[PDB]
Amino acid sequence: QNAQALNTLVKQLSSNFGAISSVLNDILSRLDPPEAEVQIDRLINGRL
Amino acid sequence: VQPTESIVRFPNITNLCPFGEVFNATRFASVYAWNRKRISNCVADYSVLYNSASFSTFKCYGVSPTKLNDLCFTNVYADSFVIRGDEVRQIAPGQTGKIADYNYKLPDDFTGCVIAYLYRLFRKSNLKPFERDIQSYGFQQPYRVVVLSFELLHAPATVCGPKKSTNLVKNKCVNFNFNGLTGTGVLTESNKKFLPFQQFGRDIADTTDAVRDPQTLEILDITPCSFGGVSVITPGTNTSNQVAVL
Amino acid sequence: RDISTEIYQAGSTPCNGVEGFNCYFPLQSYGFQPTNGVGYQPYRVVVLS
Amino acid sequence: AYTNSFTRGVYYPDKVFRSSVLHSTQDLFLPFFSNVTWFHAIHRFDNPVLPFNDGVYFASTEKSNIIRGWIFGTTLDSKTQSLLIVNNATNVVIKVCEFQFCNDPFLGVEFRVYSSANNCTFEYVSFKNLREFVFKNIDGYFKIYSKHTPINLVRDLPQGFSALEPLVDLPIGINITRFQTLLALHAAYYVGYLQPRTFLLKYNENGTITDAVDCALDPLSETKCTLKSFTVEKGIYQTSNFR
Ligand SMILES: *[C@@H]1O[C@H](CO)[C@@H](O[C@@H]2O[C@H](CO)[C@@H](O)[C@H](O)[C@H]2NC(C)=O)[C@H](O)[C@H]1NC(C)=O
Ligand SMILES: *[C@@H]1O[C@H](CO)[C@@H](O)[C@H](O)[C@H]1NC(C)=O
Ligand SMILES: *[C@@H]1O[C@H](CO)[C@@H](O)[C@H](O)[C@H]1NC(C)=O
Ligand SMILES: *[C@@H]1O[C@H](CO)[C@@H](O)[C@H](O)[C@H]1NC(C)=O
Numbered sequence: 001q002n003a004q005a006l007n008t009l010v011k012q013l014s015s016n017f018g019a020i021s022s023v024l025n026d027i028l029s030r031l032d033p034p035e036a037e038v039q040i041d042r043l044i045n046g047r048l
Numbered sequence: 049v050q051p052t053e054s055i056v057r058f059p060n061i062t063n064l065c066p067f068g069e070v071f072n073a074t075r076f077a078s079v080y081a082w083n084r085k086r087i088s089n090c091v092a093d094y095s096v097l098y099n100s101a102s103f104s105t106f107k108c109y110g111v112s113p114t115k116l117n118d119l120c121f122t123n124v125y126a127d128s129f130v131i132r133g134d135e136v137r138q139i140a141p142g143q144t145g146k147i148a149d150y151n152y153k154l155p156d157d158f159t160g161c162v163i164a165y166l167y168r169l170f171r172k173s174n175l176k177p178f179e180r181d182i183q184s185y186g187f188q189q190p191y192r193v194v195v196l197s198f199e200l201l202h203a204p205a206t207v208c209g210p211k212k213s214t215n216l217v218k219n220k221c222v223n224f225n226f227n228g229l230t231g232t233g234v235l236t237e238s239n240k241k242f243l244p245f246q247q248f249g250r251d252i253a254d255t256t257d258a259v260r261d262p263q264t265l266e267i268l269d270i271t272p273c274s275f276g277g278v279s280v281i282t283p284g285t286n287t288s289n290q291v292a293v294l
Numbered sequence: 295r296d297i298s299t300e301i302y303q304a305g306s307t308p309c310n311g312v313e314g315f316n317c318y319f320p321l322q323s324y325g326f327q328p329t330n331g332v333g334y335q336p337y338r339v340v341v342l343s
Numbered sequence: 344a345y346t347n348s349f350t351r352g353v354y355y356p357d358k359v360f361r362s363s364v365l366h367s368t369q370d371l372f373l374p375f376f377s378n379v380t381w382f383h384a385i386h387r388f389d390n391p392v393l394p395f396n397d398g399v400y401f402a403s404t405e406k407s408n409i410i411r412g413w414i415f416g417t418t419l420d421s422k423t424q425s426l427l428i429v430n431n432a433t434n435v436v437i438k439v440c441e442f443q444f445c446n447d448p449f450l451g452v453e454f455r456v457y458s459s460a461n462n463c464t465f466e467y468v469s470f471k472n473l474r475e476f477v478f479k480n481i482d483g484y485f486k487i488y489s490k491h492t493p494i495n496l497v498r499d500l501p502q503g504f505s506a507l508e509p510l511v512d513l514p515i516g517i518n519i520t521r522f523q524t525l526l527a528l529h530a531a532y533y534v535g536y537l538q539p540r541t542f543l544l545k546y547n548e549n550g551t552i553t554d555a556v557d558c559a560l561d562p563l564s565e566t567k568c569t570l571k572s573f574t575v576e577k578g579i580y581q582t583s584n585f586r
């Protein structure tokens with residue numbers, strides 16, 4: 001059970017939660033701040 | 049542990065597109081019979097043309113010569129024709145006159161760089177952008193001008209500017225960006241064996257584990273830099289002020 | 295707010311205070327005329343912070 | 344005129360090395376045990392233009408190398424650029440051109456495949472045996488996989504497992520709807536179609552795909568996919584869904 005829970009928590013990092021990308025660097029490079037900060041906010045909420 | 053040095057490595061920027069076929073050739077066609085040159089399947093290195101000496105003008109429209117090395121486009125056209133010095137302004141978005149409305153009309157929304165001969169004096173309709181609908185002018189000065197029209201479509205793009213696939217590149221103990229791979233960690237020579245078409249390795253957690261050197265096709269293990277919490281050991285302050293950390 | 299008129303250099307060859315290849319004077323004079331289009335007409339803009 | 348696929352149609356879906364693991368992926372693959380139409384193009388000739396859909400599986404067995412290539416395009420007319428793959432005895436001919444094909448293309452061994460061309464964009468030059476290929480065009484990229492292995496049965500595809508390896512990821516950007524095989528004449532092959540299905544892939548210590556499981560064949564396969572294992576113990580399990 002402990003290993004299953006840890007694996008689920010680790011695998012949750014790859015989701016998009018509705019954002020453009022699951023990598024912060026791609027969001028930073030592909031967009032300007034006034035929307036990159038919104039996408040990062042979405043990702044932050046999901047991981048919290 | 050913070051990264052020490054960032055030796056980010058990318059292979060040689062090869063091959064080189066034949067810019068010299070137009071920018072550096074010996075023959076330029078007439079303005080009313082201009083030749084459009086199609087550029088594809090090559091690395092468009094604009095530094096050589098931007099830094100080339102003996103250029104009368106170097107005019108960019110919506111682009112930057114230092115930036116064009118980092119733009120990838122599907123199709124790029126190299127318009128080459130002979131024009132005189134006084135009418136060199138006719139190759140411009142929205143400019144009017146004999147040459148633009150009769151010989152070579154540049155789009156009012158043109159994007160690219162213009163770097164620098166028969167007069168048509170009678171027309172029935174103004175020429176469209178990049179239109180060639182075919183009075184003799186005697187050169188008793190001529191200016192060889194090349195127009196770089198950058199067109200991007202939904203097709204895959206073939207002319208960017210940077211290295212393509214297969215060149216020389218190195219690796220060190222770095223922070224450790226190579227090619228499309230990023231992130232910090234220490235690199236160690238690996239005994240793993242990749243298939244010839246395999247470039248990455250991944251753990252059960254879908255995390256990057258090993259990477260193959262693009263030049264000398266060897267595989268390196270990726271071990272991340274150390275980290276951990278810090279704790280402070282102390283008796284009561286009413287006994288001493290000494291501490292020990294772990 | 296920067297108030298300077300140094301000849302900009304886009305190349306590696308120093309300008310030495312003159313325009314030329316890769317050398318530009320940063321400022322361009324506004325061509326304000328009564329014959330200009332609406333989008334090129336001068337506009338008095340006030341910013342309050 | 345019908346043979347069944349068995350365990351054919353597995354290709355490496357990426358270029359990542361994974362060792363001694365089990366991985367689940369969702370991509371276009373040839374369905375298991377879905378029967379494959381066996382064509383005899385010429386024996387009375389039928390060498391028609393077949394739709395491409397979302398991808399096409401292809402395989403054949405020949406020693407004289409009668410099939411020399413394939414033709415791809417939307418209208419198969421010079422009005423729009425089309426792709427032409429020709430395999431010479433010396434090299435490979437790949438074209439992307441506004442190409443005016445004929446009503447019966449063939450490699451006269453004359454060139455009556457076409458009559459003219461208007462534009463040209465891309466040009467590239469580089470027993471009892473079965474050569475197996477997978478063709479797909481996604482996001483304007485033409486992708487081809489290959490694998491060669493001997494056989495002992497002619498009329499039907501022998502059973503077995505061996506994954507196909509990536510060959511070319513060509514960035515052209517052509518609209519595609521139909522295709523037709525190109526042959527040299529002075530004819531036995533197969534046509535399979537790809538569907539979006541989920542599969543389990545087994546990797547050995549060398550990173551070689553050695554087994555697979557289709558997740559929609561039967562309830563046992565569903566249980567195997569759910570449990571992420573090739574072995575299922577006694578009990579009851581839930582692949583729950585509804586109709
Ligand atoms: C898969 O990995 C195994 C590792 O044990 C390979 O077995 C050895 O392979 C090497 C060459 O790669 C041979 O020199 C050894 O003799 C093999 N071991 C034994 C006990 O014979 C195996 O060859 C690998 N298979 C593939 C297809 O790469
Ligand atoms: C290629 O890279 C090597 C680095 O070893 C360098 O010496 C050489 O000048 C480079 N050549 C080109 C054309 O980039
Ligand atoms: C390109 O320019 C160089 C001078 O740097 C010259 O030697 C060469 O002949 C030119 N190439 C062509 C094709 O004109
Ligand atoms: C420490 O000792 C002093 C007197 O010796 C006392 O006033 C203080 O409250 C003590 N504090 C603690 C944390 O024990």
Ligand SMILES: *[C@@H]1O[C@H](CO)[C@@H](O)[C@H](O)[C@H]1NC(C)=O
Nearest residue numbers: 345376377378379380535536
């Ligand atoms: C399998 O065979 C049936 C008839 O036996 C046919 O209707 C079906 O289309 C075949 N499946 C294919 C060709 O994928």
Ligand SMILES: *[C@@H]1O[C@H](CO)[C@@H](O)[C@H](O)[C@H]1NC(C)=O
Nearest residue numbers: 422423424441460461462463
């Ligand atoms: C290619 O097609 C274009 C139309 O998009 C046409 O203008 C051009 O002349 C063609 N190239 C030829 C015929 O060589």
Ligand SMILES: *[C@@H]1O[C@H](CO)[C@@H](O)[C@H](O)[C@H]1NC(C)=O
Nearest residue numbers: 202417482483517518519520
């Ligand atoms: C052509 O391809 C594009 C995208 O690849 C698609 O949107 C369009 O519907 C296609 N048109 C035809 C006629 O196939």
